[PDB]
Ligand binder design. Structure first.
Ligand SMILES: CCCCCCCCCCCCCCCCCC(=O)OC[C@H](COP(=O)([O-])OCC(O)COP(=O)([O-])OC[C@@H](COC(=O)CCCCCCCCCCCCCCCCC)OC(=O)CCCCCCCCCCCCCCCCC)OC(=O)CCCCCCCCCCCCCCCCC
Ligand SMILES: CCCCCCCCCCCCCCCCCC(=O)OC[C@H](COP(=O)([O-])OCC(O)COP(=O)([O-])OC[C@@H](COC(=O)CCCCCCCCCCCCCCCCC)OC(=O)CCCCCCCCCCCCCCCCC)OC(=O)CCCCCCCCCCCCCCCCC
Ligand SMILES: CCCCCCCCCCCCCCCCC[C@@H](O)O[C@H](CO[C@H](O)CCCCCCCCCCCCCCC)COP(=O)(O)OCC[N+](C)(C)C
Ligand SMILES: CCCCCCCC/C=C\CCCCCCCC(=O)OC[C@H](COP(=O)(O)OCCN)OC(=O)CCCCCCC/C=C\CCCCCCCC
Ligand SMILES: CCCCCCCC/C=C\CCCCCCCC(=O)OC[C@H](COP(=O)(O)OCCN)OC(=O)CCCCCCC/C=C\CCCCCCCC
Ligand SMILES: CCCCCCCC/C=C\CCCCCCCC(=O)O[C@H](COC(=O)CCCCCCC/C=C/CCCCCCCC)COP(=O)(O)OCCN
Ligand SMILES: CCCCCCCCCCCC(=O)SCCNC(=O)CCNC(=O)[C@H](O)C(C)(C)COP(=O)(O)O
Lengths: 459, 128, 103, 88, 603, 178
């Protein structure tokens, strides 16, 4: 695993020693090379795992997330190239350093053979993201947003640490292999109930769960484009990865401890999908759509069936890609309008046809159009929930309909209609933006050819 | 002697059927004149800002920003806990959760009982 | 009722300007300056490059790759009627029992 | 469609054609610059009837705020030409 | 060896070549529409051969060429079904699409983006072929969503028009309401039968329970525009006329009926689902005919005619005659597509006018369209020995001699009478009276594309019914014996409809005026369903979406409970702790108190 | 559309509007030409029996009851011209209307084509450049204190002047640009 960690570390001295007008080229090229190297991890095996050493190991749940994390950085660099043009060389190097540190922390988090190291890196990811949100944020609310994005997370995970060490005082180890092989049931007791709560609430808050999601619209709206990319695409999947890793010791208590969370997620998907219908902001709409998709993933994880896990993994990957592309499109519109309001900019297919095509494809992918991996995860989770209970489909069905609605609404209000007359600063889309859109959308349609690469270890 | 039109919330009353567009008073005419005056002032301002060849940007609308701020970032500071607000919040945020919990719990209890007693015909139910 | 003199004057000026602009919207005979640079028969070639080649590719793919695996192409067994002869065996199928034919 | 590009002369000819079939107006006295209630002594109802007759003639309907102040055949022609973007 | 599978796959793959070429240089020239039309015609000619092979022998086949993925014990693969329905419906759809494209080459000449229109039509055709030839539920769902997306993209062809966008969103909404039931059916089938393959579903389901069939019926009602979810089909006429002629008349709307036909082994085992299907079809056909009888837009009337025919086919499904319903699909394709083509020709020749109040004497002013529409209306009304007689007449005989709901039978008879009546209305109001259009006459039919495209569908609607009926093997028992009055019931009711409609229409010539009645207002406003159902529910939902979900819960109470309460408590504690005047008197008084308390408490 | 609206509609305007609406809905009801002509003349006569009504309090009660009658028999599906706000082709070509300033963003390779049109375009731009500076002063001097009362603009009064705020009215794209 060091063959990928070491180049990510070496990205920092290369950036800090580069010329004042050549940092972006070097960063993008070497990030793409690192992603190409990390593509090797996709060759998983039906056997146990790729146990590299005592500290790092790779599974078919960790491999797609690692590949997505490595692939995200070049896209974030291309997205941030624009609004950091008038920025001093030292501050641009600091921004690239923060991005590289975040990628390194995520890469070390996704392997994380030991659970305490996983938690330490899980919380280490919080610092560069907070710095990015609070420093390079345009609006005045960013600071408050950052505060939220911090405290919620910590409020979730401070008990977890205690629980973690408590386990090592009883079980004696926190290595995931030993934990899996020496698993023992949790008796129905109040102490076990609170241990379950401490283990679960840590990852519930960052997913986020409905009722604990108030930090997410603030963090995504107030953050710069790269921050929105990293939060929507990868940083949301940390909770799901942690839950799928840690639910191996919570049985059979979960069989009755998942009812409040299942109810909360199955109603919050509807609530957030309806919230998306009436939104005056594009970024808030995308954030609430992300909340709905993550609530569906939470339902899948709480069901705890093989089809649930497969659908959860596929949906996480597809949602990360789709949300990243949607945030990029919204930022491209904002950089010309400088308002971030849906109804101010209208009739854009007359002026930017290729951007309208990109918007259509992104909306269709969000709308879960077959045979995309989005719908693969959707159908897997839906069938698993139907097996769990034949009534859930009703709620699920409603969500699907509502989803499509707001998606096309986002497509119709911004692209269709008559253009705004008093906006004459709509320049033709650059090659950079179109290349970013293509690099976002082509991997989705290529992954739909080989779904088993993102279906997880239970395929 | 024709049937009378009854306005509703989703089917409003026509202007020609307004019983207030006839009993005209000089105060009403003055109000209409002032409305036209302010509308013309706003239109003149917008047209002056719109036909300027030196402008190469978006004409900022204070009304749009005010609407967005009122819809988004002003709800909480004007919020006051009142019996109406408290009851509506409790209902809309608690009732559906317990309703769905009861429904799903009853369904799963019936399913588990049928599993235990044994007549459910689970044949070919391999993938779950 | 009708136009005021100011309205008439403004309308006339605006329509004169509009007509001038609309006339200016026309094109000269050489206006689209194109820069040149280069680096039965129609149906005959169409039937080869759009029909024959797909038939060849699909026939190869079905005959030598799809049918290489079992149960990929399954054919409903042909209907069998009395008096028929099977090519594989050659035996004749017994006829009916000479039911009473009347109208 | 294959619709010919109607010109100012065609519009004026059709306007006069519609006006002359209106027997309440003397065909030998009507002119392109003839006013309605002054040169021809018409009424407002006759004016709106002429407006609607032209509306059916040209296949498009003029808003009331613009129709109630079209008082001469020449300005009706010019209004139609401005609406249809006629060059010459 | 085995030419059948090769040809059946080849027609589908050669339907795809222009999509690949859309990035080439030909897409930037004016030869693209002719290229696509020639491709479609060649595909139809190639696909004519598997139909002949099936007709000669009865050849059936399923091809599982590419294995997609194995989920434990469930294998998903790209499987195509080449049964009777598929190999019979491919040539009909291809012929109709060829005619519609040749019509479009003339109708849409003034559109700057005509190549995009043609590629959209070809994409819709490909999605429909995928839907029809699908052998597993996943591929069927892929086609089900592809046809819906293509319909959405083609309805809102003119993005400037708000009504087009509203109609597209409405169609998407109703199709997703159907998608709910479709997903329910797939989930149940995989949970119980452990397979999305049709073969395993048929083997493992000797008696099908209510839930999967109810889901399938819901999806079929959603896409076929049954009475519950009907208004989207009449609203979908905002798009260009070729879109309505191809998609929303004869090809895409019969997809729900085709879905119900594909599951006929499971439909015959359940008796309640059949009753529900019969009732839904009867109410749909009656309501749509009653709406159509009093409309004034030609496109809206033809759309309601299509909806009524779909309801009749759903009735046929409900009386356990799937093959007869498929036959009616095949004939309706021909004659309804030609009817829409004639309507589009009338609209184009009449300067983009759709209302029939401005259509006068076109029997002589433009005769070819007149005779084509007369032939199509005669075929629609089931005139004997036409394409519509050989299906609709059998429908009527089957529904009369079946132990079914009597109310549904009465509704079907009244629907047939009303069909005759609004066909009479169209002919009378579009071709008989004096001209009522603007004086600038621009009527012109002298274009070879229009004439040839219409004449091919004329030949179809005249002879294809006979050819198909006499050239297919029998798949149902015949109603050999018939009461003499019951045999002629369809003809009698159709003639009565002609007579009454003509007599009531001839009264408009009279110099008498009277205000409309309540029934006329009910029928003209589409039964008030579009109004109420588009204002009462949505508003409420939207209101809630801002009142309870957005403002009250998310922005007020969820913000008050966790973060704001914590901030308030911490601020109050900080104020209390830090509010010290700096007096050491108080400090050491507290020191004395704590020294006193510790000794007593901890000893 | 082109004319500015007033603060209110007089009785004459309301009567004319009701007459036009009644005629339109009558021709919608009376499909045929002869029947429509007969009933339109009859309705003009019945509308004419109260032309010479003198007192305004009685003439406003006649039109108030005429608006209650029209609504009852208003033909819930009236005839609408195709390009009217209710017609089938109302905003069909609205997406083909591209603003003129978009031509400022064309690549020089694209501007190599059509040179004469662009030369005329800079000519028009210069004309507007001086005209706007003149019009600001003209409109500022001609406006009454406290702001305008009606949104009607004055014409040009000098020789070389152009009407104030003329650029976005004369540079309409077209009725059918494509
Ligand atoms: C039908 C199969 C066709 C196969 C032929 C090969 C096609 C390869 C396509 C690969 C992906 C396309 C790239 C995406 C961005 C497009 C780039 C661009 O800028 O366009 C401009 C370019 C040039 O035009 P231009 O004038 O210069 O630009 C002006 C504006 O852009 C104006 O632009 P516009 O107005 O022309 O619109 C752009 C256009 C293109 O933009 C798109 O939206 C295309 C993407 C559609 C997918 C939407 C997401 C949903 C998930 C589906 C995932 C499928 C991927 C499968 C694997 C793909 C491998 C990469 O949008 C559409 O045409 C509407 C698409 C809606 C179709 C809905 C049906 C989807 C399901 C169909 C079945 C798929 C599986 C079949 C399995 C069973 C049969 C074997 O036009 C194109 O290149 C269009 C390409 C053809 C459209 C493809 C639509 C369906 C095909 C999907 C993948 C094929 C499945 C494999 C089975 C083959 C058998
Ligand atoms: C077993 C022996 C077999 C032989 C049996 C006997 C043979 C036949 C006997 C004849 C039976 C009736 C024939 C008369 C046909 C009607 C023609 C007519 O008079 O229409 C003019 C007249 C209004 O004309 P208008 O408004 O002055 O004209 C406007 C302008 O002229 C502007 O006009 P426009 O130019 O725009 O367009 C004119 C258009 C517009 O006209 C309309 O306004 C459309 C309304 C008429 C359609 C009604 C026809 C069928 C009704 C089915 C209803 C099913 C149940 C509905 C449930 C309702 C629930 C409340 O009219 C038409 O185009 C033609 C109308 C339809 C005639 C063609 C088909 C009918 C003949 C076949 C019917 C039955 C025979 C089937 C054979 C089966 C074997 C037994 O319509 C009516 O007065 C309605 C009469 C029938 C309505 C029935 C529904 C009443 C429900 C009210 C509530 C009841 C209590 C429910 C309580 C529920 C509590 C829960
Ligand atoms: C706000 C955004 C979401 C955040 C997360 C929300 C979800 C948190 C809920 C955690 C799970 C449920 C809590 C307790 C579960 C115990 C099981 C209980 O529900 O069942 C009954 C228990 O009855 C009562 O619940 C007993 C406890 C009552 C006192 C607890 C307070 C309940 C309301 C508090 C709401 C405050 C929420 C906010 C906290 C900050 C059955 O009684 P019994 O079978 O005999 O005993 C079961 C336990 N045994 C087997 C170990 C002996
Ligand atoms: C044109 C280019 C080709 C030029 C001439 C070559 C002609 C064919 C000869 C090539 C060799 C044969 C070949 O293609 O190999 C088969 C090869 C795979 O080999 P297998 O191992 O047998 O299948 C995988 C399971 N083990 O098949 C192929 O990949 C090609 C054909 C695939 C089918 C087309 C797929 C199109 C649809 C895309 C996916 C859409 C979503 C999935 C469908 C959902 C259905 C539930
Ligand atoms: C036992 C004690 C438990 C202590 C729990 C600590 C919770 C961590 C957050 C503490 C923040 C409290 C301080 C505070 O909010 O001050 C009010 C402050 C005043 O503004 P100032 O910036 O300080 O001054 C500017 C004007 N002169 O108001 C704000 O701005 C609040 C903005 C930040 C919101 C932070 C939200 C934190 C709560 C989210 C969940 C965390 C709860 C943790 C405990 C969970 C309970 C088990
Ligand atoms: C975004 C806000 C989320 C905040 C976190 C929510 C989850 C909080 C769950 C409790 C946190 C601490 C749990 C303890 C960690 C597990 C350790 C354990 O299980 O050991 C238990 C210890 O159990 C405890 O001590 C639990 C006491 C809880 C103290 C802290 C209370 C915090 C508030 C409780 C109510 C909140 C529950 C619902 C929260 C919903 C989310 C806000 C057994 O101890 P022994 O003595 O060794 O065995 C006994 C037999 N010899
Ligand atoms: C199918 C739907 C049917 C709807 C029917 C609606 C009811 C129709 C019957 C209406 C009854 C009436 O006349 S209501 C009578 C309303 N009251 C008056 O008309 C009094 C004064 N009239 C005016 O001042 C006019 O302007 C005038 C002088 C006429 C012209 O003026 P001009 O010289 O400046 O053109």
């Amino acid at each position: 695993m060091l063959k990928i960690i070491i180049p990510t570390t070496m990205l920092l001295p290369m950036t800090w020693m580069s010329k004042h007008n050549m940092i972006w080229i070097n960063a993008t090229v070497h990030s793409l090379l690192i992603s190409l190297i990390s593509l090797s991890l996709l060759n998983q095996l039906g056997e146990n795992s790729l146990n590299f050493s005592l500290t790092f190991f790779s599974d078919s749940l960790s491999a797609p997330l690692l590949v997505l994390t490595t692939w995200l950085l070049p896209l974030m660099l291309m997205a941030s190239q624009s609004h950091l043009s008038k920025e001093t060389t030292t501050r641009k190097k600091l921004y690239i350093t923060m991005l590289i540190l975040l990628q390194l922390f995520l890469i070390m988090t996704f392997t994380a053979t030991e659970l305490i190291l996983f938690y330490i890196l899980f919380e280490a990811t919080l610092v560069p993201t907070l710095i990015i949100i609070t420093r390079w944020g345009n609006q005045t609310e960013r600071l408050n947003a950052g505060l939220y994005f911090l405290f919620y997370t910590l409020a979730g995970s401070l008990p977890l640490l205690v629980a973690l060490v408590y386990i090592q005082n009883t079980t004696g180890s926190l290595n995931f292999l030993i934990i899996h092989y020496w698993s023992h049931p949790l008796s129905n007791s109040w102490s076990n109930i609170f241990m379950w709560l401490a283990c679960i609430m840590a990852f519930m808050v960052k997913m986020p769960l409905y009722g604990l999601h108030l930090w997410l619209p603030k963090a995504h709206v107030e953050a710069p484009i790269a921050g929105s990319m990293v939060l929507a695409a990868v940083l949301l999947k940390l909770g799901g990865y942690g839950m799928m890793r840690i639910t191996t010791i919570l049985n059979p208590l979960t069989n009755y401890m998942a009812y409040p969370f299942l109810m909360l997620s199955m109603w919050g998907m509807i609530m957030t999908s309806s919230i998306c219908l009436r939104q005056t902001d594009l970024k808030s709409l995308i954030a609430y759509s992300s909340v709905s998709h993550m609530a569906l993933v939470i339902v899948a994880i709480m069901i705890q069936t093989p089809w649930s896990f497969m659908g959860a993994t596929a949906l996480m990957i597809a949602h990360g890609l789709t949300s990243s592309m949607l945030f990029c499109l919204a930022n491209t519109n904002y950089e010309r309008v400088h308002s971030r309001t849906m109804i101010l900019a209208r009739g854009l297919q007359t002026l930017l046809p290729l951007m309208a095509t990109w918007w259509l494809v992104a909306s269709l992918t969000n709308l879960a159009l077959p045979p995309s991996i989005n719908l693969i995860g959707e159908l897997f989770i839906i069938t698993a929930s139907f097996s769990w209970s034949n009534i859930t489909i009703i709620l699920m069905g409603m969500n699907m309909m509502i989803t499509a609605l707001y998606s096309l609404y986002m497509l119709i209000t911004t692209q269709r209609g008559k253009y705004t007359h008093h906006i004459n600063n709509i320049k033709p889309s650059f090659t950079r933006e179109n290349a970013l859109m293509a690099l976002h959308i082509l991997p989705l349609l290529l992954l739909t050819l080989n779904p088993k690469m993102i279906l997880g270890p239970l395929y | 002697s024709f049937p009378k039109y009854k306005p509703s919330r989703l089917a409003t009353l026509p202007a020609t059927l307004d019983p207030a567009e006839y009993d005209i008073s000089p105060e009403t005419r003055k109000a209409q004149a002032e409305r036209l005056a302010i509308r013309s002032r706003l239109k003149r301002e917008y047209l002056l800002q719109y036909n300027d060849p030196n402008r190469l940007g978006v004409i900022e609308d204070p009304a749009l920003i005010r609407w967005t701020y009122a819809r988004s970032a002003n709800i909480y500071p004007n919020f006051r806990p009142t019996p109406k607000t408290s009851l509506l919040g409790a209902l809309f945020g608690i009732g559906p959760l317990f309703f769905w919990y009861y429904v799903f719990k009853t369904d799963r209890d019936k399913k588990e009982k049928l599993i235990q007693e044994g007549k459910l015909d689970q044949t070919f139910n391999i993938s779950y | 009722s009708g136009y005021t003199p100011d309205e008439k004057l403004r309308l006339q000026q605006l329509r004169e300007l509009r007509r001038r602009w609309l006339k200016d919207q026309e094109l000269s005979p050489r206006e689209p300056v194109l820069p040149p640079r280069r680096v039965t028969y129609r149906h005959s070639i169409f039937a080869v490059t759009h029909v024959l080649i797909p038939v060849w590719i699909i026939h190869y793919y079905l005959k030598y790759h799809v049918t290489a695996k079992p149960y990929t192409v399954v054919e409903r067994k042909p209907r069998i009627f009395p008096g028929d002869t099977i090519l594989e065996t050659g035996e004749v199928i017994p006829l009916m029992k000479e039911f009473p034919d009347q109208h | 469609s294959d619709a010919p590009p109607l010109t100012l002369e065609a519009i004026k000819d059709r306007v006069l054609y519609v006006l002359k079939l209106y027997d309440k107006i003397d065909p030998e006295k009507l002119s392109v610059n003839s006013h309605f209630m002054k040169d021809l002594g018409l009424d407002s109802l006759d004016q709106v009837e002429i407006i609607m007759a032209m509306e059916d003639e040209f296949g498009f309907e003029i808003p009331d705020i613009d129709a109630e102040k079209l008082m001469c055949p020449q300005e009706i022609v010019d209004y139609i030409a401005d609406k249809k973007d006629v060059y010459e | 060896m085995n030419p059948f599978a090769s040809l059946t796959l080849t027609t589908l793959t050669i339907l795809t070549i222009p999509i690949m070429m859309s990035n080439s240089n030909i897409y930037k020239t004016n030869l693209y529409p002719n290229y696509v039309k020639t491709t479609v015609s060649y595909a139809f000619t190639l696909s004519l051969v598997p139909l002949l092979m099936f007709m000669h022998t009865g050849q059936e086949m399923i091809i599982s060429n590419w294995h997609w993925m194995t989920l434990q014990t469930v294998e998903l693969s790209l499987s195509f079904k080449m049964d009777y329905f598929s190999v019979m419906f491919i040539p009909v759809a291809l012929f109709v699409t060829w005619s519609i494209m040749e019509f479009s080459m003339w109708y849409m000449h003034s559109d700057p983006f005509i190549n995009r229109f043609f590629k959209y039509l070809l994409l819709f055709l490909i999605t429909m072929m995928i839907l029809v030839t699908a052998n597993n539920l996943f591929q069927l769902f892929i086609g089900w969503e592809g046809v819906g997306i293509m319909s959405f993209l083609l309805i809102g062809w003119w993005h400037g028009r708000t009504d087009a966008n509203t109609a597209a969103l409405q169609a998407i909404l109703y199709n997703r309401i159907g998608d709910i039931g479709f997903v329910l059916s797939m989930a149940w089938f995989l949970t119980h039968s452990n397979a999305w393959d049709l073969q395993q579903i048929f083997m493992l389901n000797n008696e099908c329970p209510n839930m999967p069939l109810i889901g399938l019926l819901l999806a079929a009602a959603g896409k076929s525009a049954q009475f519950g979810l009907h208004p989207w089909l009449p609203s979908a006429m905002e798009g260009p006329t070729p879109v309505s002629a191809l998609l929303h008349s004869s090809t895409m709307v019969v997809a729900g009926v085709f879905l119900l036909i594909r599951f006929y082994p499971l439909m015959e085992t359940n008796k309640l689902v059949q009753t529900m299907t019969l009732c839904l079809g009867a109410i749909t056909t009656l309501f749509t005919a009653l709406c159509a009888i009093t409309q004034n837009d030609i496109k809206k009337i033809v759309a309601f005619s299509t909806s009524s025919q779909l309801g009749l086919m759903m009735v046929t499904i409900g009386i356990n005659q799937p093959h007869l319903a498929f036959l009616h699909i095949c004939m309706h394709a021909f004659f309804k597509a030609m009817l829409f083509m004639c309507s589009g020709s009338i609209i184009h020749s009449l300067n983009d006018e759709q209302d029939i109040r401005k259509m006068g004497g076109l029997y002589k002013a433009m005769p070819f369209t007149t005779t084509a529409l007369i032939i199509g209306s005669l075929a629609l009304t089931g005139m004997p020995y036409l394409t519509g007689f050989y299906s609709k007449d059998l429908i009527i005989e089957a529904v009369n001699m079946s132990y079914t709901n009597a109310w549904a039978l009465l509704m079907t008879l009244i629907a047939t009478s009303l069909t005759a009546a609004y066909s009479t209305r169209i002919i009378f109001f579009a071709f008989l009276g004096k001209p009522r259009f603007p004086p600038l006459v621009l009527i012109n039919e002298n274009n070879p594309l229009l004439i040839n495209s219409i004449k091919r569908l004329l030949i179809g609607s005249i002879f294809a019914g006979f050819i198909i009926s006499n050239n297919i093997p029998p798949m149902t028992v015949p109603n050999t014996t018939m009461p003499l009055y019951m045999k002629m019931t369809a003809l009698i009711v159709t003639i009565m409809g002609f007579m009454l409609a003509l007599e009531l229409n001839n009264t408009t010539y009279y110099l008498k005026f009277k205000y409309p009645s309540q029934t006329y207002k009910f029928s003209n406003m589409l039964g008030y369903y579009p109004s109420i159902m588009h204002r009462l529910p949505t508003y409420h939902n939207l209101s809630m979406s801002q009142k309870s979900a957005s403002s009250l819960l998310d922005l007020i109470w969820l913000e008050t409970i966790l973060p704001k309460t914590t901030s308030f408590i911490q601020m109050k504690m900080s104020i209390m702790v830090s509010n010290q005047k700096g007096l050491i008197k108080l400090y050491f008084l507290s020191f004395l108190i704590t020294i006193m308390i510790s000794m007593t408490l901890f000893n | 559309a082109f004319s500015a609206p007033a603060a209110y509609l007089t009785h004459q305007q309301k009567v004319l509007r009701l007459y036009k609406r009644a005629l339109r809905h009558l021709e919608s009801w009376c499909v045929h030409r002869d029947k429509y002509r007969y009933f339109a003349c009859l309705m003009r006569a019945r509308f004419d029996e109260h032309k010479n009504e003198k007192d305004m309090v009685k003439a406003t009660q006649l039109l108030r009851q005429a608006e209650e009658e029209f609504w009852y028999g208003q033909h819930p599906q009236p005839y609408i011209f195709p390009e009217s706000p209710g017609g089938t082709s109302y905003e069909r070509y609205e997406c083909y209307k591209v603003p003129e300033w978009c031509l400022d963003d064309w690549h020089p390779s694209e501007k190599a084509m059509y040179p004469d049109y662009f030369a005329k375009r800079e000519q028009w731009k210069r004309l507007r450049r001086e005209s706007w500076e003149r019009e600001v002063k003209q409109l500022q001097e001609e406006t009454p204190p406290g702001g305008p009362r009606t949104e009607a603009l004055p014409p040009a009064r000098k020789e070389g002047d152009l009407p104030p705020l003329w650029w976005h009215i004369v540079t309409r794209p077209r009725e059918r640009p494509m």
